[PDB]
Design a protein around this ligand. Structure first.
Ligand SMILES: [Cl-]
Ligand SMILES: [Cl-]
Ligand SMILES: [Cl-]
Ligand SMILES: [Mg+2]
Ligand SMILES: [Mg+2]
Ligand SMILES: [Mg+2]
Ligand SMILES: [Mg+2]
Ligand SMILES: [Mg+2]
Ligand SMILES: [Mg+2]
Ligand SMILES: [Mg+2]
Ligand SMILES: [Mg+2]
Ligand SMILES: [Mg+2]
Ligand code: NA
Ligand code: NA
Ligand code: NA
Ligand code: NA
Ligand code: NA
Ligand code: NA
Ligand SMILES: [Zn+2]
Ligand SMILES: [Zn+2]
Ligand SMILES: [Zn+2]
Ligand SMILES: [Zn+2]
Ligand SMILES: [Zn+2]
Ligand SMILES: [Zn+2]
Lengths: 323, 322, 322, 323, 322, 323
């Protein structure tokens, strides 16, 4: 529109808080926050995670205790990540679909106690394989796509059976969203949402999560260099029946968030991963960055087009928003 | 290629949490601007029958009510003086009187509540004996460029009174650039200009005329025209507006959406007196639930508006706060 | 209509060769610009605690380290003088001192390494006693146009010292055109201007303030705003910038991508002190592998950046060379 | 953005090498190069090709020798083109799917020796027909589409059986990508890539290749005049399950490359064909053009949007890049 | 949703008639412009070894060959004088000599063949002792604005000689507007300007240098850059060019297509000496069929070019005529 | 691009023929022309058509005579329109698929005599029904869609059997392109093109054609007021397997031509119908318009994006072009 200085001075709107507030393009609210949480097998158990300062692994009872306050703060949903006892790992990943596995038990407990709180279970075989790869290995050590799906489908069904409102397949197998959706539909789980991890990269930013849960990748997770490829990933997942789509990691992939939102106009989520949390929190603890950087990081996801954010900062942010 | 039953759009609707996760727009108090009707005198409060629950207030009373507005976090007020009949003239000179209602109210509010935004109305219709939005020629037509000269003096007077934003509502061609030039020349470099860019010749304004004590088809836009609005806004952006506005509101949500999409600039919309009246009337009759107020406001957010001029601003801010 | 199992996106991922064939972006040393902190004096080297592995260097020491930078193929340096406290003033006059640190360092580097690009910082904050990015008025607000006058003299002084690029980081409106006019008028026809176009009011700058020995919401952009950045860059292109920049970096990759896509112009991004610190801290703690450095830089390429201002430039150039 | 001289002087960035380097939009790297290679039946055999100065036909053992250096140079992949003994040609093109045909043998030898090097086999009947047409002829002498596909499918399977990571159908039969993909999938060759020659023109630029391999076309290859048609070709091939799509010839069709990349955002390849190589090399040899024209020609493909380039200059370019 | 076997793209290919019906582009003689090398003297004809079948011709001989060109319907010639070594100078003054080869040839052709288009080359490289495309400063760099002054005088001299089109090939910034202003000021209101807008620093020019008897990376474009070309052409259109050109040709067909698509303006492309040589060489060796000539030219039409500067213009016009 | 007078004077290019020629955006050639022709049942028969001055109905032998010259002129194709004897009309339209109907006979005669000339047969029931409606009527007098298709399919097969290279379904039944394509494919007529009359309007401009062939419509032909609807029509026909798509009438619908070409980038044809021919020719004959209006009318179709034009002026235009 031929806007030219000095007729246009972009500073005028910035002059006063009230005008800054009037033109502010995006706001983060508690509607936008999803808290991931590492769940242990026992009773009366909490563990600190070395590479995620301030985040605890919680047994189910402890989860239920802390969830009262997450609920009170208005956090809409949790994303559960079980911490599988080593003795329950196997080459067939069968613990994935064990009806009394951690995820399944946590889910039923939370669904009963906090009926309005959303529960997003993780559909993935890496927490359950003795080797830690995101699926069933062939003789060469390659992750078999279609065979891994069969396990994933049985897992997802078990989650729906436990009452999960959302299942989130994080594996990066091709075709899995459609196979899971078909199974859910066949089984009558009409309303179970599927939150696809659509554009999940082969990233160095996951380091701490491995420490958190107790666990090559380039043959299934995406190359960091690729952008256009992410749109093809998403497109397939929407076609296959995903209700929501996700980019992971998050800040390092904000451009992807923006392209995905712009291209598909579908419910788009983003994961501020363990390494992102660790680097921010470590800097805040060292006195190198102000705590205000938490809300800045989260505001960036909204600005980029995310509808919702999986973030280990969800409770702190909710607290800050509520002020 | 999303297809039922693989895709069932009800799934995200099943639970409040999922509805919240996917909700595309939120209204907040940061979106609300309260228009106010300002009387001369002291201790004056007058009800408006066609705008139930809205009062015209003298300045002292405005300062009192403003305590609450500020407490609720409403970012700005839009002042509309109720000009005494005796102060109306052919030349509209009260528009730039340093002792006019708008200028006095501005000075009062700027002092008492320094963080509150004040948006003054730049317009000659409140000041003319004939009520037209400008100075007439000998054929009874509103002269564009001569009217701008008066508008410029008004705008300068508002800036001198401390207004952070002036909002030209006149629909004169070229007035945004002329006002901008004048502001700049005078050293008022940070006074915002909130252009009423796409202001339609509308029947929705009935009650406001009641409220302020006052056809426009040779200046106000034809309701039928939509492309025309883009041309209006493009010129006002080129001429230096800091924000652009569509008026009326809800009957023109398509315009809001086109303007936001085309220009990606700060976009405002006026939910006019007629809109407020319609909704109030229906609520008071028990024909609509009070929930319609937040619905109407959410519409503006959804259509692309950054801010909303609305007589519901206090009612809504209270509901949002809680 | 690509659909599984006819389309399996894993197939190109199966082998390194195919991953290489389809790889959409590559980082090279041609993408790297090293910011440097420059001290007055001789034989000075100072570690920065909040930026582990980065030192502030006096000019003689800078010349020494620069041998390696040049050997590694780093195309340019961005100089940031560490102004002695005694040289800060209300008028920011050290900004245009021919004997200032920046001007001296420029002259030294231009002579010793004629092919190395030197990008000077055009900004008044390093030179004011109050640390604000300009000259204050009597209300304590940074005056836009008066600050530009000082910026213009600074920019001319950098050109006189031989800088091939000046990078205005101030966030004054209109400053790119004013600097351009001045450069042109003076015969500095080929001095590039690298506008910091979309520079946000960010918490990520903490460590830099430590490094150079120094709110900005009335000039720096609101983190929440994205469309606004397009307007910023459009003006700076119109005003004559040769390259445009987004700052900070990684928290604003969406902005980089929007700016590249909209304008198709040379686009740069600053991976700021806070970003470097976060990553370094996590690497030193064993929380992240050192591979994150090239990942972070690749992100900027993927988002559309042509060049990256990064304190990792040497570490990355070494890794790329090998 | 209203950029106007003298405020905008596009020469400023060009003033110095460092700024030229900073704004340079595209770079060619060895990641972008695919070397086509003509493979003979014997042992200890090399032949010079008259119309491709500097390019040799190589027996398998010789191929393995030269490949050490292609590998050392970082060339990611080869595209194999067998030189069929005349005695092995027939009206049924059966040699195409012979498990001990040249392509199959070369493939197994290279897969074993250089496991990381990509092998792209040619799925085409023209090297195998007594007549040299790209398929099986009917009584009128027309190339039968669906009957030719059946042979092509058997060929592609035989290549996957030999270990090829990519099969590249170059025939221009309609529907072939889907038929090959279905067959590969049915057979369990889940990860064998299909590099479709999607927009392959009826071009005069192929002349030397006929000399190289020892071999109307307008009823299957595209009319040079047509652009929009190429987008329809590509679209079908992506829908049919191609992993990569290719334009051939290359320089003479750079506009097609750009439209294809822009429209589909998919992995896009381009073939700098025998006639392009010959005309450049002949000019360089005559002293008419500088050797720098090699990297200029290849940079154009990147600039146009190609991800990868099949080029007889791959070794020379790799050498030049490595300096 | 076109899908095999319902859609078989071979069907339209089955028969020549259907191929003709659907053919998207045709080359005609109206698309061809013949560049010519012009010698001083009388009765001179010189073969160029690196451009087999092309001769440099003195003016009298050019007039003779032109009879055939005109008979074949070739719309225009692009004249390239072969400057005597003794007429080259630091100041490039032969460029605007009314008695220069270009000016004489123009006058001769305008008289003898009034309907034939004459496109003169506006450029200083044929006239400088050093061969650079402009006037050098004391550092050996081509001064942009001083070179334009000489270019303007050249262009005026071509207009005075009767040229219907001047084609600035220099790659000076701003030269199209400066030449346009001058033409307009002088009353040359209908002299076309054919800007070489996107002219790359290319190895394809080798033979031309042979032909006319003569790095450029500080003015000619980097082969790697494509977005940059849009900026080049946008400026030249704004500055008043009537047609815009890409050079070289076939190695830059993506550029042609981007330029046509973006601007929808008259777009021309130069199939340069190196391109002609490559093709000729291969044809003479029996490596390519002569059909490649029409294929190469069709490519330019397909990419979006309106006109093609090509040394094959006569060969192709003969083939088309028949 | 900020082009402004007097720096930009759009007249400069117009100053001289040579520059007009250089920038001329579109050219009509004989490659673009398709001649419709009304074919009678007899021998040695020609009839003049009152409302189409200058156009004759021709028996097959006469058609073959005139076609030598159409061929000599380079006209690529004819579109045949038989003139059905009244005695051969019926409620079932069976004459449509009679192997010795006029169209079928003309086709075989022309295919044999002029093998390179394209023949486009008309797939339509209106020339064959006693009532003249474009299909089989129900009790209410409505044209039954799916029942009419069955006849159309049998017609099209009979045309392919006669050797037609293109069949052109002009009926405006929904779904017909797909049904015809399926049938052709099932029958092995792999290469028979289908030229869909995709956007065919309920127009007053067809008046003379009824006079020519010897023959409500608003329930199948399109409303003249509708534009967007034409894109939906076309889209369906491409999806159903049309090789070419057509707009009819022509000049009065040039906007449709442009939108269709722009939207689909597919081979697009346009019919300059009988009423368009009549009004031009009547004006030329009255001395009201110059003959140059013929090439102007045809140039408009090219300008609008048409690849080919069905026009009763094809011979005159070809003659004019050849000069
Ligand atoms: Cl007026
Ligand atoms: Cl200011
Ligand atoms: Cl210069
Ligand atoms: Mg307890
Ligand atoms: Mg996927
Ligand atoms: Mg207006
Ligand atoms: Mg700015
Ligand atoms: Mg040996
Ligand atoms: Mg195909
Ligand atoms: Mg230029
Ligand atoms: Mg006879
Ligand atoms: Mg239809
Ligand atoms: Na949200
Ligand atoms: Na707002
Ligand atoms: Na770069
Ligand atoms: Na590549
Ligand atoms: Na042309
Ligand atoms: Na055509
Ligand atoms: Zn996993
Ligand atoms: Zn008014
Ligand atoms: Zn600053
Ligand atoms: Zn073949
Ligand atoms: Zn030159
Ligand atoms: Zn019909």
């Amino acid at each position: 529109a031929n806007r030219a200085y000095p007729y246009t001075r972009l500073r005028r709107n910035r002059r006063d808080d009230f005008s800054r507030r009037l033109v502010r393009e995006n706001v983060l609210t508690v509607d936008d926050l999803i808290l991931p949480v590492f769940v242990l097998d026992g009773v009366n158990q909490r563990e600190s995670i070395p590479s995620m300062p301030g985040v605890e692994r919680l047994s189910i009872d402890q989860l239920l205790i802390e969830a009262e306050e997450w609920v009170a703060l208005g956090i809409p949903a949790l994303a559960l990540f079980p911490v599988t006892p080593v003795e329950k790992k196997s080459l067939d990943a069968a613990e994935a679909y064990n009806p009394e596995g951690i995820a399944q038990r946590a889910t039923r407990a939370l669904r009963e106690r906090f009926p309005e709180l959303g529960i997003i279970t993780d559909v993935a075989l890496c927490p359950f394989t003795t080797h830690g790869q995101c699926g069933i290995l062939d003789d060469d050590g390659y992750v078999l796509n279609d065979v891994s799906i069969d396990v994933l489908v049985r897992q997802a069904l078990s989650h729906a059976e436990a009452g999960a409102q959302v299942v989130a397949p994080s594996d990066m197998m091709d075709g899995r969203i459609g196979a899971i959706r078909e199974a859910l539909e066949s089984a009558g789980h009409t309303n179970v949402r599927v939150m696809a991890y659509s554009a999940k990269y082969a990233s160095a930013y996951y380091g701490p999560f491995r420490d958190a849960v107790g666990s090559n990748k380039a043959t299934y997770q995406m190359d960091p260099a690729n952008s256009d490829e992410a749109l093809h990933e998403v497109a397939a997942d929407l076609a296959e029946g995903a209700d929501m789509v996700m980019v992971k990691p998050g800040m390092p992939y904000l451009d992807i968030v923006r392209r995905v939102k712009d291209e598909f106009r579908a419910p788009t989520f983003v994961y501020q991963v363990s390494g992102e949390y660790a680097m921010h929190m470590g800097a805040i603890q060292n006195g190198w960055l102000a705590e205000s950087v938490i809300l800045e990081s989260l505001t960036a996801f909204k600005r980029a087009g995310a509808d919702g954010i999986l973030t280990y900062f969800a409770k702190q942010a909710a607290e800050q928003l509520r002020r």
